[PDB]
C-alpha cells in the first residue's frame, strides 16, 4: 500500500543489531580469508553490500561454501575497514590506508566507496 | 576510530537488498508458520527486528530449527504486515488491521511499533 508510515531510524537500528550479532559471532555462516587473516560474517550482509559477494553467493556451487579465499593482492586491513563499513555505514578512511581501501572496494565492487576514495585522492593532488 | 566518514543512505540500501533477497527466496533459512500460512525469511533479520525472534534464535536448540510455529492466536495478515515492516521500515497501518498489528507486535516484542499503534488508537478514542 501507498498509505504506509515509515520509521526513520529502523534501517540503522537493524544494522546496529546485525553488527552486534557479528561481534558476538551469532549465526555467522562464512569465513573470508585474506592473506591468512580470517573474518567471520553473515553471507546476506556481504551480498547486500558488495557486487563481488552478491555474485559469489548467488552461484549454485559457491553459495554452499563456508570459507571464501580472496585474491592474495588484497590487503587484510583494507578488507577489515570495508567489512566494518558494511555493518556500520562508517568508513575509517586515512591517508595511510586510502590506496588499500580503494583497491579493495574496487575488487569487492562497492561503487559508492570507490567514488568517495577517488574524490579524497583527487583533493590531495 | 572517531575520524570515520558516514554514508547516509547505506543502512536503507542494505535493507533494500535484504528485502530483494527475501523476494527472490535467496539464502532464506527459516519458515515461520502462522495458522497454516508460511513465511520464508532470514533468521538474522528477524532477530535484529524482534525481541521474540532474538530470544528464539539465540537458544542453543531453537537456533537450528528450520520451521518455527507461532501461537495460534496470531493473525497471518498482522504477521505479514510486520514482516514487510522489518524488511522495509514501512508499516501498512489501517483502521481494519491496527488491532491485529498491535497484538502481533506485542507478541513479537517490537517496541516502537507497539508505541505507534497505541498512539493511533488513542487518537481515534
Amino acid at each position: 500500500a501507498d498509505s504506509c508510515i515509515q520509521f526513520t531510524r529502523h534501517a540503522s537500528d537493524v544494522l546496529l543489531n546485525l553488527n552486534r550479532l557479528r561481534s558476538r559471532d551469532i549465526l555467522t555462516d562464512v569465513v573470508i580469508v585474506v592473506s591468512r587473516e580470517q573474518f567471520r560474517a553473515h553471507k546476506t550482509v556481504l551480498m547486500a553490500c558488495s557486487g563481488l559477494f552478491y555474485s559469489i553467493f548467488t552461484d549454485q556451487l559457491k553459495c554452499n561454501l563456508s570459507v571464501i579465499n580472496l585474491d592474495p593482492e588484497i590487503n587484510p586491513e583494507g578488507f577489515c575497514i570495508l567489512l566494518d563499513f558494511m555493518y556500520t555505514s562508517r568508513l575509517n578512511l586515512r591517508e595511510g590506508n586510502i590506496m588499500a581501501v580503494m583497491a579493495t572496494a574496487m575488487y569487492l565492487q562497492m561503487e559508492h566507496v570507490v567514488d568517495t576514495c577517488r574524490k579524497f585522492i583527487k583533493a590531495s593532488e | 576510530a572517531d575520524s570515520c566518514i558516514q554514508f547516509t543512505r547505506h543502512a536503507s540500501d542494505v535493507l533494500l537488498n535484504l528485502n530483494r533477497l527475501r523476494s527472490r527466496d535467496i539464502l532464506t533459512d527459516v519458515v515461520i508458520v502462522v495458522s497454516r500460512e508460511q513465511f520464508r525469511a532470514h533468521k538474522t533479520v528477524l532477530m535484529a527486528c524482534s525481541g521474540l525472534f532474538y530470544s528464539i534464535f539465540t537458544d542453543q536448540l531453537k537456533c537450528n530449527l528450520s520451521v518455527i510455529n507461532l501461537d495460534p492466536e496470531i493473525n497471518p495478515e498482522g504477521f505479514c504486515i510486520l514482516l514487510d515492516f522489518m524488511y522495509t521500515s514501512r508499516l501498512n497501518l489501517r483502521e481494519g488491521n491496527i488491532m491485529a498489528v498491535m497484538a502481533t507486535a506485542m507478541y513479537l516484542q517490537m517496541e516502537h511499533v507497539v508505541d505507534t499503534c497505541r498512539k493511533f488508537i488513542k487518537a481515534s478514542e
Binding site: 515509515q6 520509521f7 526513520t8 | 514501512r90
Partner: peptide, 5 residues
C-alpha cells in the same frame, strides 16, 4: 520517529 514517506 515515524513519518509520511
Amino acid at each position: 520517529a515515524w513519518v509520511i514517506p
